[PDB]
Short mmCIF file of C-alpha atoms in Angstrom, two decimals:
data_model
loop_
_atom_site.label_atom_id
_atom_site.label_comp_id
_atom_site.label_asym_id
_atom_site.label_seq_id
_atom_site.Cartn_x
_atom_site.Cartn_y
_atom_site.Cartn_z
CA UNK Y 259 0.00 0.00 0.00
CA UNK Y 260 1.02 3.80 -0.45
CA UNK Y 261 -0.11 4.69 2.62
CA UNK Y 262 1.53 2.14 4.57
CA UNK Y 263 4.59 2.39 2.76
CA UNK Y 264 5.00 6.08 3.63
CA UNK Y 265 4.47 5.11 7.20
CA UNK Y 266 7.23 2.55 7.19
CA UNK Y 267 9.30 5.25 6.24
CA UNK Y 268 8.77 7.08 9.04
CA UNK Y 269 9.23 3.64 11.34
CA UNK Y 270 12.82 3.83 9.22
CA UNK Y 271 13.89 7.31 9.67
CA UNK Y 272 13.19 7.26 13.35
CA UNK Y 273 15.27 4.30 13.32
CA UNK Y 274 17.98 6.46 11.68
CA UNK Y 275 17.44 9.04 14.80
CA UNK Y 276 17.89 6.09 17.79
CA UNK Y 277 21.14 5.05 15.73
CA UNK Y 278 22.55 8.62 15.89
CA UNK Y 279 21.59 8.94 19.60
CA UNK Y 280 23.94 5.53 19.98
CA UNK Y 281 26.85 7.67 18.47
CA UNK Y 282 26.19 10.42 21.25
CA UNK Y 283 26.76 7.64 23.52
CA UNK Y 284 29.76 6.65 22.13
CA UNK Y 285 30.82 10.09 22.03
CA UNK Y 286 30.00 10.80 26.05
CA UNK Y 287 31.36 7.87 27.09
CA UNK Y 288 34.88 8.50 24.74
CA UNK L 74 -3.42 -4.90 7.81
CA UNK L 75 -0.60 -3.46 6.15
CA UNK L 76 -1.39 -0.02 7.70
CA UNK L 77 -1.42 -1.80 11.08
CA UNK L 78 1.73 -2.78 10.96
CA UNK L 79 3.52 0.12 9.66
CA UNK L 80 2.07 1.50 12.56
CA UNK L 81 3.62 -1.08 14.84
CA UNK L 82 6.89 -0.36 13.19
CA UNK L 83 7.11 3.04 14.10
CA UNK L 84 6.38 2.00 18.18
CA UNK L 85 8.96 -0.68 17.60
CA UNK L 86 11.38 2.52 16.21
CA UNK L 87 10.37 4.61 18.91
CA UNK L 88 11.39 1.46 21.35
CA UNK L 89 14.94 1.64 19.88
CA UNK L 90 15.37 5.54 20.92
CA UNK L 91 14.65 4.74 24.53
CA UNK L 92 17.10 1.98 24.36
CA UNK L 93 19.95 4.47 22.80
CA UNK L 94 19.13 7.21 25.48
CA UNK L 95 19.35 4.26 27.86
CA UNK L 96 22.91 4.14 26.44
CA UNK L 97 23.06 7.69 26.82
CA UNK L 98 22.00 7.75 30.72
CA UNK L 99 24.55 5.07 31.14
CA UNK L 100 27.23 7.12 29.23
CA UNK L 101 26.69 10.04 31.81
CA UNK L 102 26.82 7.61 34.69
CA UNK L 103 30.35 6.15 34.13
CA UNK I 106 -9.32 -2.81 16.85
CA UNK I 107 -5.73 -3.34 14.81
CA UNK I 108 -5.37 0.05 14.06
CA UNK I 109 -6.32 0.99 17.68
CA UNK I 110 -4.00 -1.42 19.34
CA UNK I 111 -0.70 -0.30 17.07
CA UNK I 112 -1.60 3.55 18.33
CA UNK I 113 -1.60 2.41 21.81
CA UNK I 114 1.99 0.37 21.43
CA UNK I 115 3.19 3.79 20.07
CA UNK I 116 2.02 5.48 23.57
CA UNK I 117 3.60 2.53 25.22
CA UNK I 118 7.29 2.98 23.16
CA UNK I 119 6.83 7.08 23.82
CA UNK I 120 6.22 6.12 27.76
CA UNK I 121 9.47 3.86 27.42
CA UNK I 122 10.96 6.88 25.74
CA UNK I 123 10.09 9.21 29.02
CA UNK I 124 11.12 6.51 31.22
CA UNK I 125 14.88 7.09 29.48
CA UNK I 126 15.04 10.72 30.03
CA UNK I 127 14.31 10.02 33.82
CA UNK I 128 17.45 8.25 34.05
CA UNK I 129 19.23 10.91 32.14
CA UNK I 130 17.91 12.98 34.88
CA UNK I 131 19.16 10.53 37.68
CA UNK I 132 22.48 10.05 35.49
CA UNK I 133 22.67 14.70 35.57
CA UNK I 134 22.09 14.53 39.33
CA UNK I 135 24.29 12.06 40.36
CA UNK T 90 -14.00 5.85 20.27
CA UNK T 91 -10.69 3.17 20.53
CA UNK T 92 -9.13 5.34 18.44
CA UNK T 93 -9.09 8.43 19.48
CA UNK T 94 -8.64 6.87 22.86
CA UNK T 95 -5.78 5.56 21.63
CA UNK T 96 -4.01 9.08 20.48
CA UNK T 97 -5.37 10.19 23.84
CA UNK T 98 -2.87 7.61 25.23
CA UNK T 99 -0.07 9.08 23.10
CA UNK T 100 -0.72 12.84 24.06
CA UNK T 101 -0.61 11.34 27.75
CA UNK T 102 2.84 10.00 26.70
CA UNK T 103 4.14 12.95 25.54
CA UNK T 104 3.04 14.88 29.09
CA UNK T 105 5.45 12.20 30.63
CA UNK T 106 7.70 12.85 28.55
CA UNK T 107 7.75 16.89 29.00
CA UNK T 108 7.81 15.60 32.85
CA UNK T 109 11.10 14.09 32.69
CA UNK T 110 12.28 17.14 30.76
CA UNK T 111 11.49 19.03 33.42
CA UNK T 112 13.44 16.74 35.99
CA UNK T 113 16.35 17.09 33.53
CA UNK T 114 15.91 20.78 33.98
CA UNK T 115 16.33 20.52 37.56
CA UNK T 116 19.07 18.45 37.47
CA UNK T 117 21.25 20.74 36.24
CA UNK T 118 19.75 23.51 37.95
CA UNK T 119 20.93 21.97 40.87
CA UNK O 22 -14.84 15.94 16.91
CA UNK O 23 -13.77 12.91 19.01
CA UNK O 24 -10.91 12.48 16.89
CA UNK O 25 -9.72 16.28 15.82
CA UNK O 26 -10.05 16.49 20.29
CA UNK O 27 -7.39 14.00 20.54
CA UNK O 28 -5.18 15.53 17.85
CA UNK O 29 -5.24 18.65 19.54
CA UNK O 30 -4.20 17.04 23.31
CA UNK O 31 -1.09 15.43 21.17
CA UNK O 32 -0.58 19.30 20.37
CA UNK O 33 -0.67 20.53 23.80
CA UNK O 34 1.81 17.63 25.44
CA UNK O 35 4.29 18.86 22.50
CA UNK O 36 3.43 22.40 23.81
CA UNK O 37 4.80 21.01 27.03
CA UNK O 38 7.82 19.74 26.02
CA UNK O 39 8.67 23.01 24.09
CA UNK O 40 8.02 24.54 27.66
CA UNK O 41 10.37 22.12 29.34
CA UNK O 42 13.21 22.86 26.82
CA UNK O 43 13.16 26.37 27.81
CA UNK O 44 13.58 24.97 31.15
CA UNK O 45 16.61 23.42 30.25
CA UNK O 46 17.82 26.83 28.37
CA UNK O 47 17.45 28.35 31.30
CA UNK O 48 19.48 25.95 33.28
CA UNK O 49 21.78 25.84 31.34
CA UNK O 50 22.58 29.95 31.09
CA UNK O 51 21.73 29.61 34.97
CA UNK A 266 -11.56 21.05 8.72
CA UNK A 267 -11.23 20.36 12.20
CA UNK A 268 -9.17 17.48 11.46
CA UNK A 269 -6.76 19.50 9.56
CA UNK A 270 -6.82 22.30 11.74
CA UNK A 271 -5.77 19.44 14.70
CA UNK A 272 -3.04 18.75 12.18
CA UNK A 273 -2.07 21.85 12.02
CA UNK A 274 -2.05 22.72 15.98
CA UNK A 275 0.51 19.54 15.94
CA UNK A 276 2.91 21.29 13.47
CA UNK A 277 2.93 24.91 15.56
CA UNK A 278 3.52 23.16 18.59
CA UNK A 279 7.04 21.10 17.09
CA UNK A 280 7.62 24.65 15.38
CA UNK A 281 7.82 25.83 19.44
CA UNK A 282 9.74 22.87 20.14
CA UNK A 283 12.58 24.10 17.53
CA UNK A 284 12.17 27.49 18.83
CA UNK A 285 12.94 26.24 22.80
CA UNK A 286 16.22 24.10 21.11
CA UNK A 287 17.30 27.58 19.23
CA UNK A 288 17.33 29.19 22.89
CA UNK A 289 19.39 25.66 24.24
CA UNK A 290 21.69 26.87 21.26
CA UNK A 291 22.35 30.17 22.15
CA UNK A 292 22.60 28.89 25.66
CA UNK A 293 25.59 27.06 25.30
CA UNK A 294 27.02 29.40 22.70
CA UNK A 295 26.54 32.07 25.83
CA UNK B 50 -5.68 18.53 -0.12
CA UNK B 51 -6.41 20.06 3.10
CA UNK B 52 -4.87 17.01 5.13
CA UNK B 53 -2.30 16.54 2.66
CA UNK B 54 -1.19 20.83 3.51
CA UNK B 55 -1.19 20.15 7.24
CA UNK B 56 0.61 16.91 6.92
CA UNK B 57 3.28 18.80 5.04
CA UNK B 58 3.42 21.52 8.14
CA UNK B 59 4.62 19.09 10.41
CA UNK B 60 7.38 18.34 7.93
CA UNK B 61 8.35 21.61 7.63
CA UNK B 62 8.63 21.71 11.49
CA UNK B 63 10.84 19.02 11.83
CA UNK B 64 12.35 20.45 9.42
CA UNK B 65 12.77 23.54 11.79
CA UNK B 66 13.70 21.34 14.53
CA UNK B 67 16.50 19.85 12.87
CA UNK B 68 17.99 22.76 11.79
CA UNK B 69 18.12 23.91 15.71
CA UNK B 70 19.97 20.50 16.26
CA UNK B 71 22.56 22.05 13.76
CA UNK B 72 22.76 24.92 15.56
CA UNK B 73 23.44 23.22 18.70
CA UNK B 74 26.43 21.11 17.06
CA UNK B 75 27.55 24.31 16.37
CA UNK B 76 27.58 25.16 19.85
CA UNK B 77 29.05 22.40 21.16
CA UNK B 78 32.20 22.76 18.75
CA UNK B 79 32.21 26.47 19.54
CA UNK H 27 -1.03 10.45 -3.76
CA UNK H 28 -1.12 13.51 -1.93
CA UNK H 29 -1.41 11.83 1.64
CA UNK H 30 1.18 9.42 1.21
CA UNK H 31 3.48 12.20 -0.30
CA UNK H 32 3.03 14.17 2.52
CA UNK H 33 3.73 11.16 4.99
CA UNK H 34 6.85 10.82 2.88
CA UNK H 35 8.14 14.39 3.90
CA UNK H 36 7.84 13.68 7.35
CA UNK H 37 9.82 10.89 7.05
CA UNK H 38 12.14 13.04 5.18
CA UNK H 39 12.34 15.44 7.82
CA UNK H 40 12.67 12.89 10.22
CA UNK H 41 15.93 11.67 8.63
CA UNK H 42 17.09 14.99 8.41
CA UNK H 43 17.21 15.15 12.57
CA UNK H 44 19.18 12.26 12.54
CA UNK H 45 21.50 13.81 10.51
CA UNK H 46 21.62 17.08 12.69
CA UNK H 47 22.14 14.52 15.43
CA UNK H 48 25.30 12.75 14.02
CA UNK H 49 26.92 16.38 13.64
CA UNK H 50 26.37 16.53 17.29
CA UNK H 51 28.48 13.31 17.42
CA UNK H 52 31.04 14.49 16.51
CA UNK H 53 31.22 17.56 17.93
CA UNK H 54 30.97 15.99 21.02
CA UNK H 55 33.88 13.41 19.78
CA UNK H 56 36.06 16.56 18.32
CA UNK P 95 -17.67 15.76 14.97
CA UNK P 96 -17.46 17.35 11.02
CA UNK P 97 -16.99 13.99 9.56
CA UNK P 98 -19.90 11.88 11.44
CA UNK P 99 -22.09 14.42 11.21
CA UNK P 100 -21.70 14.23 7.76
CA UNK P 101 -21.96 10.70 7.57
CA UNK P 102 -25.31 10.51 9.78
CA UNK P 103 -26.89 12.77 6.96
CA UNK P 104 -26.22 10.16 4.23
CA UNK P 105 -27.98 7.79 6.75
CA UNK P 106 -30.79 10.30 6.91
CA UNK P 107 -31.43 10.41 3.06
CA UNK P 108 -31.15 6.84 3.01
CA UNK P 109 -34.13 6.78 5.53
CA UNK P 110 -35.51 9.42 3.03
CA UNK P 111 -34.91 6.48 -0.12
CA UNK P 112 -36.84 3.70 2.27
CA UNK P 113 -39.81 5.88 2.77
CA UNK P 114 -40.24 6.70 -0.63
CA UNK P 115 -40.02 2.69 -1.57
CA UNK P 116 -42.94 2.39 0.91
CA UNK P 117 -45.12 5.09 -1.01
CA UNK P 118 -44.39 2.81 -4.24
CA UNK P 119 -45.64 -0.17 -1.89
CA UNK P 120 -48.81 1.63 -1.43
CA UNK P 121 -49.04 2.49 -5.39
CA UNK P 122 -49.40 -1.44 -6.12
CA UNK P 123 -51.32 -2.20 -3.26
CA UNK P 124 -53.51 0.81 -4.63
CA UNK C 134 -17.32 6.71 19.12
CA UNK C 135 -19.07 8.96 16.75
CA UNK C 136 -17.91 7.81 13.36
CA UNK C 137 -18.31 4.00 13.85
CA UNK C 138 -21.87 5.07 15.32
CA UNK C 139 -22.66 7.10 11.91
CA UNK C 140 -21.82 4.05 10.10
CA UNK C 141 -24.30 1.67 12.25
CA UNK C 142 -26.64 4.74 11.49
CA UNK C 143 -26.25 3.72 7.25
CA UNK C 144 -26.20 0.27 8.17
CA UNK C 145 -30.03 0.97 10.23
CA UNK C 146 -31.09 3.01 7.34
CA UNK C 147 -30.47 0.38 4.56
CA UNK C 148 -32.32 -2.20 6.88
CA UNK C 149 -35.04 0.61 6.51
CA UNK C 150 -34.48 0.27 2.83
CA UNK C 151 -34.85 -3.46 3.07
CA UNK C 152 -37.93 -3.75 4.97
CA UNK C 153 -39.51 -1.12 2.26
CA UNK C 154 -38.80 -3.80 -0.45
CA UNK C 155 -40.81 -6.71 1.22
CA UNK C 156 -43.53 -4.45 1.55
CA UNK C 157 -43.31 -3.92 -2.18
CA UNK C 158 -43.30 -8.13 -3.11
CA UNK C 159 -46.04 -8.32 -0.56
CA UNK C 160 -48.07 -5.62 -2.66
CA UNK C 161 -46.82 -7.85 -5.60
CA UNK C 162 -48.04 -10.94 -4.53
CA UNK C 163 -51.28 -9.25 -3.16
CA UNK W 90 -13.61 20.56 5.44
CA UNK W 91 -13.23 19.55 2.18
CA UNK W 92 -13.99 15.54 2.95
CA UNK W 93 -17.28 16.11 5.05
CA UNK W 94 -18.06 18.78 2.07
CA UNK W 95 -17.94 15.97 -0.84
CA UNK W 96 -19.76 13.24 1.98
CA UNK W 97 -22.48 15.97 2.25
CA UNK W 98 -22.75 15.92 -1.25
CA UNK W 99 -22.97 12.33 -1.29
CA UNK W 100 -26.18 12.81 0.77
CA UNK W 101 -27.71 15.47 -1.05
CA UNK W 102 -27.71 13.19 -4.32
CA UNK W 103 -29.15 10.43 -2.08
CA UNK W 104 -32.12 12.64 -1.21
CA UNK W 105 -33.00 13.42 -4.99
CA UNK W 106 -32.81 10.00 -5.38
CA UNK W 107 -35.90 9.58 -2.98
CA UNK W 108 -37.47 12.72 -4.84
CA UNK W 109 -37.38 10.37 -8.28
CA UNK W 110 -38.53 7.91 -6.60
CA UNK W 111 -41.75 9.30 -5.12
CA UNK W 112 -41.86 10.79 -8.66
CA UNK W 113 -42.08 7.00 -9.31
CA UNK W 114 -44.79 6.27 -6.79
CA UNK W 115 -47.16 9.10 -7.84
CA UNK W 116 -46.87 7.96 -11.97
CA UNK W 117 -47.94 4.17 -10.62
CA UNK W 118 -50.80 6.17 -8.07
CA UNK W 119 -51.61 8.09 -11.31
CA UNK R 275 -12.45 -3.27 15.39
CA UNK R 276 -15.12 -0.47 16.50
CA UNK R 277 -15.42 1.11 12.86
CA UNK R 278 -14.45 -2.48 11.34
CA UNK R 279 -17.65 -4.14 12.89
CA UNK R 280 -19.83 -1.10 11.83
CA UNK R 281 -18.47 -1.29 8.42
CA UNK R 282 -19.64 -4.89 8.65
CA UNK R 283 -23.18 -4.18 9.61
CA UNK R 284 -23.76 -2.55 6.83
CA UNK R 285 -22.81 -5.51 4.52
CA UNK R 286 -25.49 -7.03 6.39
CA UNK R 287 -28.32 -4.78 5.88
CA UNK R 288 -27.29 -4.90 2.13
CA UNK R 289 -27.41 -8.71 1.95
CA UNK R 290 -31.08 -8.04 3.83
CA UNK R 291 -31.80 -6.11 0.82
CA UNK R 292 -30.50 -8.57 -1.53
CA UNK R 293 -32.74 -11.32 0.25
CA UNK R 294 -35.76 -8.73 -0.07
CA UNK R 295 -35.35 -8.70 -4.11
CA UNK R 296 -35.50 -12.63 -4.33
CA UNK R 297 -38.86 -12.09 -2.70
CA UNK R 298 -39.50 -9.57 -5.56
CA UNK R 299 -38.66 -12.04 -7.99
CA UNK R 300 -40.60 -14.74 -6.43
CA UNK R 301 -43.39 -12.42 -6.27
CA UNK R 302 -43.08 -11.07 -9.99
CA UNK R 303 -43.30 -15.41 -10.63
CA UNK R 304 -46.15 -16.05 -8.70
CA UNK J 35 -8.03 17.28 -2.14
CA UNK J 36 -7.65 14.39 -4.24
CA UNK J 37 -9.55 11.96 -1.80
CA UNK J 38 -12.49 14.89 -1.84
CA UNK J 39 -12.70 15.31 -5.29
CA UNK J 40 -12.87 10.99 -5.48
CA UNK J 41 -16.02 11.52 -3.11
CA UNK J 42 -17.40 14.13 -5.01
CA UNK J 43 -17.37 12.21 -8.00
CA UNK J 44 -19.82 9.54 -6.29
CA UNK J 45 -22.53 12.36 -5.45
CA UNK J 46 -22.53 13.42 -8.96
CA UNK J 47 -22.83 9.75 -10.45
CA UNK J 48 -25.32 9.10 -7.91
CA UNK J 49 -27.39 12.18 -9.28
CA UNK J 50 -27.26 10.89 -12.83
CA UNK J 51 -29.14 7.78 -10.97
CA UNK J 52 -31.29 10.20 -9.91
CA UNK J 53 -31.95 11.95 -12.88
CA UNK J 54 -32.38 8.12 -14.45
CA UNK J 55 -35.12 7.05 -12.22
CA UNK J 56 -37.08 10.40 -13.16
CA UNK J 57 -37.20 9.51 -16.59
CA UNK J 58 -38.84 6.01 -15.61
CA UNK J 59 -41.43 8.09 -13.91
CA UNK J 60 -41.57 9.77 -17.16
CA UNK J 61 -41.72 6.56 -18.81
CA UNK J 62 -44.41 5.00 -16.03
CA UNK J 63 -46.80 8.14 -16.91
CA UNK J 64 -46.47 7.88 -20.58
CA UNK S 40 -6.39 -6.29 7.73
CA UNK S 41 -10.25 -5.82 9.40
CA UNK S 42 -10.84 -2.77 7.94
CA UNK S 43 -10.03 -3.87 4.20
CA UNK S 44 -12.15 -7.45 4.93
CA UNK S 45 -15.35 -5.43 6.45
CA UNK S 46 -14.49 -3.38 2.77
CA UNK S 47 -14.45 -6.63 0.99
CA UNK S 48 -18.18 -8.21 2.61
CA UNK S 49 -19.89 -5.21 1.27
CA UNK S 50 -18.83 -5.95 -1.77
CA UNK S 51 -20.01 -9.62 -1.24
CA UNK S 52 -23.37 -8.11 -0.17
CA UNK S 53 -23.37 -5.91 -3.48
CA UNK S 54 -22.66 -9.06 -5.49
CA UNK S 55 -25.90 -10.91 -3.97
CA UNK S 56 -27.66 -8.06 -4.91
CA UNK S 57 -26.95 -8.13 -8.70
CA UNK S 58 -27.52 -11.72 -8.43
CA UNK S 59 -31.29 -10.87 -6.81
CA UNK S 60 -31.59 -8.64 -9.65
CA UNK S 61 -30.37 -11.45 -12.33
CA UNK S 62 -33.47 -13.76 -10.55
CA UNK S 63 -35.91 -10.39 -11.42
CA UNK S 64 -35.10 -10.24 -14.89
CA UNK S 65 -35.75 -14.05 -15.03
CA UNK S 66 -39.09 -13.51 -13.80
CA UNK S 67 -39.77 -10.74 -16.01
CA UNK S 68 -38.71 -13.26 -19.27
CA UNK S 69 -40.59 -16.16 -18.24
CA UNK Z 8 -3.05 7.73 -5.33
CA UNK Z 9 -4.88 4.44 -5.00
CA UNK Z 10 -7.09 5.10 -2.58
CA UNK Z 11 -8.58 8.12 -4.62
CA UNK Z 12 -8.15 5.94 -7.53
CA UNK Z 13 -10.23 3.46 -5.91
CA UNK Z 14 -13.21 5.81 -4.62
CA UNK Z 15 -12.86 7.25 -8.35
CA UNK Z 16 -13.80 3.80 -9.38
CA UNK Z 17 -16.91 3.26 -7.50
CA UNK Z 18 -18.26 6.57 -9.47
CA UNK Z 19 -17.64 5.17 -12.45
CA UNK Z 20 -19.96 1.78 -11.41
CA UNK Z 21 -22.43 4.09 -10.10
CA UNK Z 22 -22.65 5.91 -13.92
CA UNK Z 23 -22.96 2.62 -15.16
CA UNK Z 24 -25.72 1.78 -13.14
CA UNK Z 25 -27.34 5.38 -14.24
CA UNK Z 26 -26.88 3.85 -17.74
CA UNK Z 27 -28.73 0.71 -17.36
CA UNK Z 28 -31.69 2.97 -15.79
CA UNK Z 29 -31.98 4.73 -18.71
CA UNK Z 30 -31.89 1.86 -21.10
CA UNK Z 31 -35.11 0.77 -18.55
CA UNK Z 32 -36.78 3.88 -19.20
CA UNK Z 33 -36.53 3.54 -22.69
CA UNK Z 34 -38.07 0.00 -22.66
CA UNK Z 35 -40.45 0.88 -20.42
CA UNK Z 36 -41.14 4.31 -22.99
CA UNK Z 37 -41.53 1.70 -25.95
CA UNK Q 154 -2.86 -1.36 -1.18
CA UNK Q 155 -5.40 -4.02 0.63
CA UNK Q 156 -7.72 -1.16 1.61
CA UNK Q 157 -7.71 0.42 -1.64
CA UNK Q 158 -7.89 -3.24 -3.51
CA UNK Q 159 -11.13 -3.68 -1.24
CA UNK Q 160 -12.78 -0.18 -2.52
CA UNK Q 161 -11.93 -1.95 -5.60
CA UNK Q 162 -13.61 -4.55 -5.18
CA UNK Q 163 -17.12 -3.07 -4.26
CA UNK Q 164 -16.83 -0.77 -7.58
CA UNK Q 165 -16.65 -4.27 -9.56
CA UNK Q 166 -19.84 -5.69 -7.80
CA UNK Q 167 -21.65 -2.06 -8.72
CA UNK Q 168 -20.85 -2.98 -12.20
CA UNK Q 169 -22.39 -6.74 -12.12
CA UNK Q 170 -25.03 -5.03 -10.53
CA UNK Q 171 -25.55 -2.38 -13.55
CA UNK Q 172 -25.09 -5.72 -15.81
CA UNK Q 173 -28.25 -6.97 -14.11
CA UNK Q 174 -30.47 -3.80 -14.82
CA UNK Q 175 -29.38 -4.10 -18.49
CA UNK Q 176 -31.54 -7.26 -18.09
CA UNK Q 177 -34.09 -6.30 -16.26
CA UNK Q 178 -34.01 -3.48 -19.43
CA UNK Q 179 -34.16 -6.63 -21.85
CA UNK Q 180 -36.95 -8.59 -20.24
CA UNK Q 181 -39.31 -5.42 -20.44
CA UNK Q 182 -38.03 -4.98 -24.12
CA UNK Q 183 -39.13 -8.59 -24.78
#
């Protein structure tokens, strides 16, 4: 579906944002 | 329903933030 | 209802999500 | 309705979220 | 509307958090 | 539309939630 | 559409929220 | 479709804060 | 709300269709 | 909630709508 | 709104349908 | 579903209409 | 709004039913 | 999906109706 | 999109239907 | 998309049901 498909991105971009808050971690704990 | 589940996969991205700021609060602690 | 239930498990992941920043808090203070 | 019971539910996520905001505030505050 | 009601009280916890980031402004020029 | 005005309300309230981050900015720039 | 135009408003303030994140990677290097 | 285009942008946006993120990162590592 | 209000007035003019079937019940009868 | 209860409200009407149409084959067969 | 606009319409047609057909009725009374 | 299970009553008022057609028939036979 | 406009298009086929079922009164009191 | 197979039983219900309409048009030929 | 494509569909059954009216009311006119 | 595929779905019974008027428009012809 279109609809769904756009939502997924979403799901994928915000998975994009929790792997650039693991970097901050690296970077506060380096 | 395809719409269901892209919804699911955004809760299941959102999940993965609170783990990285989990990683984040443990960054600060040590 | 599907659609009902993935909404909720979105509350649910943003709840998780609030439950991070209170360590983050706890990580700040101590 | 479930659903708009069910974005009720993430609107009261977001308050608890804004909450532990606020206890970051105070953290470094104090 | 049920629904457009519930849309609005996701609006108004997001108007919280915007208020608790100021918090944390402050703070942080405090 | 009351739904789209609902919509709307959601996308002044993240435009406050930049706005608060723009004062964390100048914060630490200060 | 009228959904459609509000839709694309919250876009456009995320859009405004991560360009506030820039700012603050500014201030951290600064 | 206009809906799912407009879903698309927030998605867009979305990815866009991740990347505002990773530049804090590295300021944070620098 | 905008959208079941609208809704229950399609319901209504479908009431509006059943009475006139009855009137075309009493023709033959007649 | 108010939209699913418009849509039992069509569902009543066409029932309406049915009922109308026996009354016709009874004038029919009468 | 532009959606319970068009399902108004969608009513209003409905309700000259019943007009035709207690045009219908009165030619078989007649 | 709340809106699934009215969506579903109104399949069943239609297939009460369809039944009320055969009677039609069998009364145009008789 | 494309969905609106898809809507719209119903009420005006349904008015050409409409318009159908008044000639058939036409026809019934020829 | 619910939604898309309380979609799909109207459209059952509409078929049974064109089928009640096939037995009317026997009636009317013999 | 589909969705619109979809509704657009259902107006285009609905004409047809308006057709086959007509083609009544000219049998019933001869 | 399954919803959209559904919508579908009910414009193709619409059409077997305009098929069936065209014989209900044949038997009165004959």
């Amino acid at each position: 579906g279109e609809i769904a498909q756009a939502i997924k991105e979403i799901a994928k971009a915000i998975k994009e944002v929790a792997w650039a808050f693991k970097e901050i971690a690296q970077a506060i704990k380096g």
